[PDB]
Amino acid sequence: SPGIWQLDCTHLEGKVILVAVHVASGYIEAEVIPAETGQETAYFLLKLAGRWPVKTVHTDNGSNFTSTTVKAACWWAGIKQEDGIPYNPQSQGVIESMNKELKKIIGQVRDQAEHLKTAVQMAVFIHNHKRKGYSAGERIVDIIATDIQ
Amino acid sequence: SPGIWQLDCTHLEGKVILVAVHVASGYIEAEVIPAETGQETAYFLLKLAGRWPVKTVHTDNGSNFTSTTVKAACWWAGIKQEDGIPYNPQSQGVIESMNKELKKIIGQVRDQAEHLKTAVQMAVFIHNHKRKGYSAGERIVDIIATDIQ
Numbered sequence: 001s002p003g004i005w006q007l008d009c010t011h012l013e014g015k016v017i018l019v020a021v022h023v024a025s026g027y028i029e030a031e032v033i034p035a036e037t038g039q040e041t042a043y044f045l046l047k048l049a050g051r052w053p054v055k056t057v058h059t060d061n062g063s064n065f066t067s068t069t070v071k072a073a074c075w076w077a078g079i080k081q082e083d084g085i086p087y088n089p090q091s092q093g094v095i096e097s098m099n100k101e102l103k104k105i106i107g108q109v110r111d112q113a114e115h116l117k118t119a120v121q122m123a124v125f126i127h128n129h130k131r132k133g134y135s136a137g138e139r140i141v142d143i144i145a146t147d148i149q
Numbered sequence: 150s151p152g153i154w155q156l157d158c159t160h161l162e163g164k165v166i167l168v169a170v171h172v173a174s175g176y177i178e179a180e181v182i183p184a185e186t187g188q189e190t191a192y193f194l195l196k197l198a199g200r201w202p203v204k205t206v207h208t209d210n211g212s213n214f215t216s217t218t219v220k221a222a223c224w225w226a227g228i229k230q231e232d233g234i235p236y237n238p239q240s241q242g243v244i245e246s247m248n249k250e251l252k253k254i255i256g257q258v259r260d261q262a263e264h265l266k267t268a269v270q271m272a273v274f275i276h277n278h279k280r281k282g283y284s285a286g287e288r289i290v291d292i293i294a295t296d297i298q
């Protein structure tokens with residue numbers, strides 16, 4: 001549970017926003033890329049796993065699941081690459097809700113940056129600090145610290 | 150001190166590696182950029198602060214300290230922007246040592262990636278996971294969790 005992340009890909013302004021969600025906390029990391037490729041996805045996971053103890057990744061689609069570059073990054077970083085089949089139906093909904101919330105925040109900050117990537121990082125900030133009470137940033141640290149002890 | 154980070158800029162292969170060190174743990178995040186500008190430094194800090202509770206940043210040089218874009222990002226993200234003067238002489242040495250260790254790791258992984266940015270993320274991964282016994286990634290989580298509690 002402390003080590004499980006889910007990949008999520010959403011679109012805006014003709015660009016792609018790749019998101020990793022820490023399932024147990026709702027904490028996120030995201031980046032803007034021109035298109036979702038195996039190489040972009042691989043690099044994103046390598047970044048993520050150098051930063052948090054990533055044990056398992058539920059990939060966002062079958063192409064990233066199949067991708068030999070994505071499998072190579074997961075091998076490199078010690079990550080168990082799994083499919084993203086929502087055996088729990090509530091998962092599709094949580095992710096769609098998350099994409100809608102993130103797009104809302106992006107629109108609230110959109111005029112504060114020329115580039116979409118800036119707005120996306122502002123939205124990540126607001127999302128992770130939003131007190132729900134604890135924030136997602138607080139919850140991820142507590143979950144992992146509890147795990148280490 | 151759970152919220153204090155130090156910026157560090159180093160060079161390799163005619164490119165710039167921008168590093169943020171979490172002082173109390175030695176945990177790092179880094180990126181490759183073509184040149185250190187205020188815009189690049191501002192964007193990097195915005196990413197960092199959406200991911201960890203960044204309270205204070207010791208800037209790496211006077212230009213980033215002066216930079217109005219860097220000040221604007223620190224304002225946006227709630228970061229107290231400070232100078233980086235090593236009033237403590239041991240700070241120079243610690244950072245110099247980290248740069249040499251990071252470059253060493255980059256050399257050990259260099260052939261496993263075409264692009265320097267890939268090698269740099271591999272190096273961040275090895276650095277944050279190295280047990281010295283706890284790893285820097287373990288120490289940062291514990292420091293911040295204790296703080297939240």
Ligand SMILES: C=CCN(Cc1ccccc1C(=O)NCc1ccccc1)Cc1ccc2c(c1C(=O)[O-])OCO2
Nearest residue numbers: 111112113114115118188189191192195218221222225
């Ligand atoms: C001259 C700086 C460039 N602009 C100015 C701007 C243009 C249009 C609207 C507002 C602003 C503004 O000053 N917002 C406050 C602010 C500044 C920095 C960080 C957070 C908030 C911000 C910026 C900086 C670094 C970046 C960027 C961008 C970006 O515009 O996307 O993209 C990659 O790294």
Ligand SMILES: C=CCN(Cc1ccccc1C(=O)NCc1ccccc1)Cc1ccc2c(c1C(=O)[O-])OCO2
Nearest residue numbers: 039040042043046069072073076260261262263264267
């Ligand atoms: C087909 C992918 C391209 N290469 C292949 C390669 C070229 C030269 C030497 C080795 C390799 C190799 O397969 N290493 C294993 C490996 C693959 C992925 C992640 C970690 C380790 C890796 C790569 C992937 C994504 C990226 C990259 C790069 C990069 O080469 O820098 O840069 C930004 O996103």
